[PDB]
Amino acid sequence: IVGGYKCEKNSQPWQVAVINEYLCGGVLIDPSWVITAAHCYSNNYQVLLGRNNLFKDEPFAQRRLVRQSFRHPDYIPLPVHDHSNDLMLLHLSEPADITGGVKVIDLPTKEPKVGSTCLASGWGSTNPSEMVVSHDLQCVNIHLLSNEKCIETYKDNVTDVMLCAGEMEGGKDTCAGDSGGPLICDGVLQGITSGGATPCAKPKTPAIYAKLIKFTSWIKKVMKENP
Ligand SMILES: [Zn+2]
């Protein structure tokens, strides 16, 4: 998170850290499921829950293993790779404890409004040009912008599955390491951060997020088949 602030202690209880050869964010949607970006795909993972500081002895800290991962079918890995359908479900080895620090967040049930105020969190890069892992969870308030503002949305019909957010002025963005974290507008979880390569927070260059609302059906069905 470039241009944000330190989130208040345990104010984002559904935020997880997904770790393998990549740092990613994740979001707890069920004691047993974590949604993240497909970009974070790997043979293994370590899921960190209930944390503020990634490198600290914290009380609600939990660590889970993954049993199985499900990348959205239409994601094309880095055939030309794009950031549409950048979604992956992680089925936890054993459920997360729902504590005063670890809680689930709900899937959205309504379409996001252009101009609504959104918050994004992560331990990703706080420097827009180079990668500086942040120990503390960072939070930033941005805006839901018209998809017209995001150049990526003009491809095929990807507009359909993407949200566009940030500030036209730059200075505030999600960045490398933030992929897979949440985008919460007006209190709703509406997006999943996609790939955030440096440089970030460029003026007139808002970022791409998975329009969650469009994948709940897929999310639903998967969890259903994986009791
Ligand atoms: Zn990519």
From Swiss-Prot:
The gene is Klk2. Residues 1-224 form the Peptidase S1 domain. Glycans are attached at N157. It catalyses: Preferential cleavage of Arg-|-Xaa bonds in small molecule substrates. Highly selective action to release kallidin (lysyl-bradykinin) from kininogen involves hydrolysis of Met-|-Xaa or Leu-|-Xaa. This is Tonin. GO terms for biological process: regulation of systemic arterial blood pressure; zymogen activation. One of its GO terms (molecular function) is serine-type peptidase activity. Keywords: Disulfide bond, Glycoprotein, Hydrolase, Metal-binding, Protease, Serine protease, Signal, Zinc, Zymogen.
